[PDB]
């Protein structure tokens, strides 16, 4: 039963793991757009392009 409980809680970890990744992925996408926006504000403002 001990190791049973172990697998049980480790399954929970996996869930947490993937859900964290989900959030992380979203965050990355968000921050990606953010820095992308910086280029859209900077590269077009300098007029060199």
């Amino acid at each position: 039963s001990a190791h049973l409980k172990l697998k049980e809680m480790q399954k929970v970890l996996n869930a947490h793991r993937q859900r964290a990744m989900e959030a992380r992925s979203s965050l990355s996408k968000a921050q990606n757009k953010s820095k992308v926006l910086t280029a859209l504000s900077r590269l077009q403002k300098s007029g060199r392009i």
């Binding site: 403002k45 300098s46 007029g47 060199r48």
Partner: protein, 48 residues
């Protein structure tokens, strides 16, 4: 009629040159701002 056409062409050329000079001044101001930002970055980030 020839003098009026020449004056209209000269006024159009002057307006185009003024627009080009305004665009060049805006580009020069943007380049100066970018150079100032690059200098500030090279001064701050290189302090370590």
């Amino acid at each position: 009629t020839s003098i009026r056409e020449t004056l209209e062409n000269g006024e159009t050329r002057m307006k185009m040159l003024n627009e080009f000079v305004k665009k060049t001044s805006e580009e020069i101001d943007s380049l100066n701002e970018d150079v100032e930002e690059i200098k500030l970055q090279k001064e701050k980030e290189l302090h370590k």
